[PDB]
Design a binder for this molecule. Sequence first.
Ligand code: APR
Ligand code: APR
Lengths: 168, 177
Amino acid sequence: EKPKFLEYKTCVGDLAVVIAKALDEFKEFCIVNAANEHMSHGGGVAKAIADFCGPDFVEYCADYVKKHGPQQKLVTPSFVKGIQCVNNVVGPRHGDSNLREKLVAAYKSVLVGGVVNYVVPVLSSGIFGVDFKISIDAMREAFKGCAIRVLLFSLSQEHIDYFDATCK
Amino acid sequence: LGSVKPATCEKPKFLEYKTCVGDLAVVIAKALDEFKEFCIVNAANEHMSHGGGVAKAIADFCGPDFVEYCADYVKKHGPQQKLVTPSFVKGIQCVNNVVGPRHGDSNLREKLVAAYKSVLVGGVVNYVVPVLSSGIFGVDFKISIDAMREAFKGCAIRVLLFSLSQEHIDYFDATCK
Ligand SMILES: Nc1ncnc2c1ncn2[C@@H]1O[C@@H](COP(=O)(O)OP(=O)(O)OC[C@@H]2O[C@H](O)[C@H](O)[C@@H]2O)[C@@H](O)[C@H]1O
Ligand SMILES: Nc1ncnc2c1ncn2[C@@H]1O[C@H](COP(=O)(O)OP(=O)(O)OC[C@H]2O[C@H](O)[C@H](O)[C@@H]2O)[C@@H](O)[C@H]1O
């Protein structure tokens, strides 16, 4: 029950509504977190995911960074039925750097072995405002030819309208 | 050789199986949510070198304390067919490093059965178990899974079997038929 090829869906809303939708439509999926390399889940989707997943997830992440140092990608328990795992991905920050290629590498790092359904925020395009258009294009490049299902979500309607502009 | 600190989980009424296909982190993600504590089984060599396969992933995950524990123990006691070590991971009661047999070894079935039997650790009820010997040890996965079910039959334990390979897990589903 892989898909035959890449399938997209969209959701504009807070994490709670996104997760309810993904559970209804995917049944089981990986949630992607827009993380920093310290896994310090202080704001944005990171805070929402840490609040939703709870203290065992926050503790997991903190403990891992303590043992292994800062991480650019960290796959964790979610402690939530239907969420196979959290994939904490570190996007570039504004003034970075070289944004398109960094965002492609970030979205490519979303894929995990044994997971087909992904619930994915617009990386880098909130708490440190990278242009959402390059994040979104970067995602489309990253996932080309992958047999996965991707539910792109965001608080901003503009992000999804823009995404629909190429899927339309 | 002493015993591991006993589980706070109780044994199930009968043998219970779960499965997970994918990378180690995805497996452990599932095990941490389903089991409050467990033993993870490593498909080791007698040197406890962890140079490839699931051993390398487990070594990387558990970290340098784990690496150091194994190198020190082997240095002092020599090579080991079985070593139960600390994990240095919350929820992971111990790592049971089991050396499975290899392609062409004589009495290969019976050696697999014995290897899975050695998985059991006193005071552990929940196990996360790979398909022993089916990677670089070259053993047919079907025979390894058959041997596992033989070794665990009648045991009041919970076993999450895992593999990178969907075919391995589909096979196991067909033994439950
Ligand atoms: N990163 C991983 N995540 C999850 N499962 C894995 C991973 N790597 C391998 N596996 C799975 O564990 C397997 C056991 O395969 P190997 O790891 O190759 O084990 P084995 O065939 O017993 O080989 C023995 C060993 O190889 C290692 O180098 C080890 O140190 C010893 O030399 C199969 O089920 C395989 O899909
Ligand atoms: N509660 C929420 N629900 C749904 N989506 C959200 C929420 N909060 C933010 N988002 C969305 O997540 C995407 C990424 O926004 P941020 O979370 O601000 O992520 P990012 O810009 O990559 O910044 C990462 C940094 O912010 C966090 O503090 C995190 O710990 C890291 O330091 C955007 O599409 C944004 O609308």
